[PDB]
Amino acid sequence: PNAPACMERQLEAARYRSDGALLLGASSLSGRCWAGSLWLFKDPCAAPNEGFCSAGVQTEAGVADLTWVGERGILVASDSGAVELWELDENETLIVSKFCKYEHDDIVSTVSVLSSGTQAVSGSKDICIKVWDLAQQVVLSSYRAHAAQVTCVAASPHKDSVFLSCSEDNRILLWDTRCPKPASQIGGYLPTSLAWHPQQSEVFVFGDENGTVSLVDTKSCVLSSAVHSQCVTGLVFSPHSVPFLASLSEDCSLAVLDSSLSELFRSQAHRDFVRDATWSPLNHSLLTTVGWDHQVVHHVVPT
Amino acid sequence: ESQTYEVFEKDPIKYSQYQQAIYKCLLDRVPEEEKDTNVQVLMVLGAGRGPLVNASLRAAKQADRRIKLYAVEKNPNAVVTLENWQFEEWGSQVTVVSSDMREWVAPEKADIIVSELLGSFADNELSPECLDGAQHFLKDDGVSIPGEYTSFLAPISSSKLYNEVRACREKDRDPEAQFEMPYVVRLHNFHQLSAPQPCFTFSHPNRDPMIDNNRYCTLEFPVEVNTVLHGFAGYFETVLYQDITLSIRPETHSPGMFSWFPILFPIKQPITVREGQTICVRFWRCSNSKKVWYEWAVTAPVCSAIHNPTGRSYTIGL
Amino acid sequence: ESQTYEVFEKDPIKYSQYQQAIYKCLLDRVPEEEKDTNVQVLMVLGAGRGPLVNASLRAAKQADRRIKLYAVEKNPNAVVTLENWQFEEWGSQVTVVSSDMREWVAPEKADIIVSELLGSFADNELSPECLDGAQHFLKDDGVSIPGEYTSFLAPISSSKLYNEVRACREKDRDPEAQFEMPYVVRLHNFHQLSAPQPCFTFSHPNRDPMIDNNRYCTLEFPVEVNTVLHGFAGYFETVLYQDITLSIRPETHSPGMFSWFPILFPIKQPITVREGQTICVRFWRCSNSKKVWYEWAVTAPVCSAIHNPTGRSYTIGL
Amino acid sequence: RVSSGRDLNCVPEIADTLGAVAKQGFDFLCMPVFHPRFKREFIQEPAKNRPGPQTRSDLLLSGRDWNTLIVGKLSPWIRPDSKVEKIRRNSEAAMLQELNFGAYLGLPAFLLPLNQEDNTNLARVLTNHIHTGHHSSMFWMRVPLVAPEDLRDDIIENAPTTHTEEYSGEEKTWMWWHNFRTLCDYSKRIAVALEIGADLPSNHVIDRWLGEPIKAAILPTSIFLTNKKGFPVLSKMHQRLIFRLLKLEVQFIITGTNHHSEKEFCSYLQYLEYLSQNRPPPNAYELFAKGYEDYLQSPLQPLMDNL
Ligand SMILES: N=C(N)Nc1ncc(CN2C(=O)c3ccccc3[C@H]2C(=O)NCc2ccc(F)cc2)s1
Ligand SMILES: N=C(N)Nc1ncc(CN2C(=O)c3ccccc3[C@H]2C(=O)NCc2ccc(F)cc2)s1
Ligand SMILES: CSC[C@H]1O[C@@H](n2cnc3c(N)ncnc32)[C@H](O)[C@@H]1O
Ligand SMILES: CSC[C@H]1O[C@@H](n2cnc3c(N)ncnc32)[C@H](O)[C@@H]1O
Secondary structure, three states, rough: OOOOOOOEEEEEEEOOOOOOOOEEEEEEEOEEEEEEEEEEEOOHHHHHOOOOEEEEOOOOOOEEEEEOOOEEEEEEEEEOOOEEEEOOOOOOOOOEEEEEEEEOOEEEEEEOOOOOOOOOEEOOOOOEEEEEOOOOEEEEEEOOOOOOEEEEEEOOOOOOOOEEEEEEOOOEEOOOOOOOOOOOOOOOOOEEEEEEEOOOOOEEEEEOOOOOEEEEOOOOOOOOEEEEOOEEEEEEEEEOOOOOEEEEEEOOOOEEEOOOEEEEEEEEOOOOEEEEEEEEEOOEEEEEEEEEEOOOEEEEOOO | OOHHHHHOOHEEEEEEHHHHHHHHHHHHOOOOOOOOOOEEEEEEEOOOHHHHHHHHHHHHHHOOOOEEEEEEEOOOHHHHHHHHHHHHHHHHHHHEOOOOOOEEEEEEEEEEEEEEEEEEOOOHHHHHHHHHHHOOEEEEEEEEEEEEEEEEEEEEEEEEHHHHHHHOOOOOOOOOOOEEEEEEEEOOOOOOOOOOEEEEEEEEEOOOOOOOOOEEEEEEEEEEOOOOEEEEEEEEEEEEEOOOOEOOOOOOOOOOOOOOOOOEEEEEEEEEEEOOEEEEEEEEEEEEEOEEEEEEEEOOOOOOEOOOOHHOOOEEOO | HHHHHHHHOOHHHHHHHHHHHHHHHHHHHOOOOOOOOOOOEEEOOOOOOOHHHHHHHHHHHHHHEEEEEEEEOHHHHHHHHHHHHHHHHHHHOOEEOOHHHHHHOOOOOOOEEEEEEOEEEEEOOOOHOOOOOOOOEEEEEEEEEEEEEEEEEEEEEEEEHHHHHOOOOOOOOOOOOHHHEEOOOOOOOEEOOOOOOOEEEEEEOOOOOOOOOOEEEEEEOOOOEEEEEEEEEEEEEEEEOOOOOOOOHHOOOOOOOOOOOEEEEEEEEEEEEOOOEEEEEEEEEEEEEEEEEEEEEEEEEOOOOEEEEHOOOOOOOO | OEEEEEEEEOOOOOOHHHHHHHHHHOEEEEEEOOOOOOOOOOOOOOOOHHOOOHHHHHHHHHHHHHHHHHEEOOOOOOEEEHHHOOHHHHHHHHHHHHHHHHHHHEEEEEEEEEOOOOOOOHHHHHHHOOOOOOOOOEEEEEOOOOOHHHOOOEEEEOOOOOOOOOOOHHHHHHHHHHHHHHHOOOOEEEEEEOOOOOOOOHHHHHHHOOOOOEEEEEHHHOOOOOOOOEEOOHHHHHHHHHHHHHHHHOOOEEEEEOOOOOOHHHHHHHHHHHHHOOOOOHHHHHHHOOOOOOOOOOOOOOOOOOO
């Protein structure tokens, strides 16, 4: 289908867009060639079959993290040290490379698009955090705030200048580019994943390496719960008015939590590391997970 | 290491004999009328980087018979090579197993087991113990390749080699530890005092109740010259199947093959030997639950000390 | 040896605690209404010359409950004593088993298992590994005596003991091997620099999935005097059942008992320690399929070398 | 003239990568043996029973290539001194695995990081590996002149950078090394790969590393200034350091992406060559002495012996 013959084993990311087309990033973390790829599925249930895909393309290096840039654009965090942007064509069959800027000196692990949609922030193992402009295709600012590998960065949903970041130095920095000193350290176990609350601009949740999922207000006093037995890889809120939090981990499980971090759902479907989750925008009760076991499981969340 | 497997693979004569050995066994077990009905279950026990696996494929193709391959290998570094080969080349016909053959719980019994667990003294790699442990998942009418192997000994005189061993004294161990351990060596400046005689033999599959791999052999070597005994050169022969064999015994040495060099069992003190006298050597194969080792002693024309008692100087790890 | 078991048996305080420990457990498991209906299956794992067997008989009589005894013992020399006792005294109530507990295939599951596999550092006899291997033939609601044990460490200053260890240098081994191995010793001319702290703990039956007996402990000892660190004194506590315990920790030392002396973990070089500074020691429990061993290193106030890496100087045989 | 290599943490095709690196004029390549992000479980099911190959095949390069041109790197996720017991145990098994594979390939050197104070368990595992087998592979400990914490940008509002002169505190990265090599008991297989920062520390901090086994000197691309022509150069401060390092005869490694995108990547190396040629040449003393650097010989006794 005008795409690579075969995709890689380790599925790293999975995102839905407005209409409900399932994006897929995948990396080869084993074997001869260590490269990555990007795929599109207008049929979610056809995944991860290469013969039944709308779009697909082979990247130079592995895909660490990606996210939607609206509808067409796809921003990538590459192992090469480049932040890559790809854009779907008008037919939405091909995926042409927009830019590919080698700026990070080490693997780009995390990336997130800001409110405006013309900017994005990336995090790398080189310890830097860079602010990009997607129009001019240049780095606006470069910040060596952390003292270790930057694990996760998360743009504030409704604020362009604000974003979170967390690192192995055991810091959770809340940023604000308007200030002279933008970073602000929020006061045991290392932070791994971040997730802003959708309906509240002052709230966020973070998962640690020990498996504890926490609930933090920017003002104050925190709530938490021991969800997973291992590192929390990612946290994604549902599109509901009263949102449910889906938590993934390296313990090969999925858990859907309520407002007070109480366990609603449990799914030991995956046999390998659960890497990403994405709620179906059409049907809010559906949730699609992807893992290194090369499954694309669709869960029916009891709502 | 990688380059240790590399040099093993750089001997085409050995594997051609393995290829031919399996080839013949396939034709014997599977008739012409049951060509595409019967699929033989082969199991390479100690696959390494998979020369025997390749050979087993070639053997099946020239024979034109169906085979199902396993590739058991305990070394996890080699398993990486096997799986990369398996993914690219072999496919689902070869099932790479990353385990010890003594431990591995088989999901299927084998018609043939193929192994390459032999050293310069045949059984100094503990091929007996390994294949005994892997004997359960062989069929009751199953074949082993090799099916048999024997070790040979011959007394030598080498004031060079004696003086070489002598210089292997190391700090922080017995002053005469070096004399109580075998060495792999291309014997060159030496004198073979008598013709090689068989020492230890092993047959697989072993059917003897309470299979004991401990042994005690007495050999008498008629010497026809004055000389000074400095040690015993060790060789081996192995029957792969029937008439297909490998050997490093000088008189029946496989031509071209350069896989195994001879082994040397030194002695602490040189022993005078007059023409007409007989050199009498004794060799034990000893073991416990942890180790296997050899002991040896000369008894004629004069007595030597028993070498390597309780494997104090040299053991082979199980 | 016989006289090694003799001196073990010459401590009545230990076995009285074992007697009391079993006594209590019998009353808990078996109620009054099921006095002569239920017969508890006891299994002494490591019976020796059978003091625990005797104690188990006494405990059953004072409790007035029915018991069925096994007496597992691997040492065949001791088994001779057990069987002579069993024939003359005990009878068919005690079933003497001459086997390793890790191997022995049980014909019946036990309600209680009793063991005496503890040393001066608790787990330096590999009580964890043995009781883990004997865990299968325990009932799902079965008890172990002891149920728990912990080891303690405390830094000491002894220019005597340091100089004593120093003089244990032997021919044909590492010049500093003596410093990389523990010693059982009645500590007398020494100075305990800080209060003992717990190092390693073990609970039986172990229910933790994939039971790993490897450990890594960091301890920080607040020192309040100038001194010179020469080693670490080792003690242990063990919970037999509930409130019944044995201990050689000075502050909670069982009164009268003289079964275990303290253990000593030396260091190659003495370390200066100023008043106010903290001695920071690290202790590993390491193992493979053959051996178990300890490693240790001081990290504050100055670093020492890691002692006994890969059990080069000292191992405990499985 | 100068021996130099290339540090990469991304290799999509091992054969192609070398070709590029070799064409640029580098002698060896520092690269991962397992994919940096390929995190592996060893205890908990079902992730421990992950199928398929764990990494690349050794066949992709020749034995001689592995032995002379490749330098291994410990994966970044391997943290043997983690507070979490699970991550510790996993990192132990993973570290052993990678080191063992390094020995299997027969690599001449292998990089392990010193990026924090407590590297005790790291040392304990490495020491165990050293005392297993008879490999002679070197181990280069990646340790910075200035700790990451001490060179971070002062851009955190409620956590300003230490503006105080801490004489002992500025020598912390040496104490990291000192403790590690003491624990390992001065193994001759363990050496230093000194990573040079953008801002060099005080002079005493640099003098600290005199008489230490420095085999490598890692140079990020970010520390390079740009001249009027528009090509990479270094400061007069860094020039004096490189001049000192050339006397020790260390192997300069280049790490990081090409910030000078206009020019080739050779330019960096060419500058080190430029420096190599532009030094004070060896006098009669240093000409003849070249060979006997730190070579122990017994004092002559012309009285007792006959010369
Ligand atoms: N082949 C298996 N499965 N097992 C085996 N066990 C033992 C084997 C035989 N050898 C050794 O015991 C040995 C020890 C050190 C060095 C080399 C060897 C090896 C050996 O004798 N090789 C001969 C050789 C050496 C160098 C050379 F350029 C060409 C040929 S083969
Ligand atoms: N009791 C089990 N089942 N196991 C055990 N493992 C270890 C144990 C403790 N001991 C030793 O490790 C040891 C070593 C050498 C000599 C003696 C001992 C013994 C010990 O410390 N005994 C004290 C003692 C010594 C002499 C004396 F006249 C009176 C009391 S007890
Ligand atoms: C090709 S050299 C022999 C091979 O057999 C392997 N081997 C030896 N003993 C065993 C065993 N018990 N189980 C599995 N592989 C083994 C060795 O690791 C080596 O790669
Ligand atoms: C009374 S001292 C402890 C006793 O336990 C025995 N013992 C130790 N380990 C085992 C084992 N694995 N199986 C059986 N007996 C054991 C020892 O031989 C000793 O007599």
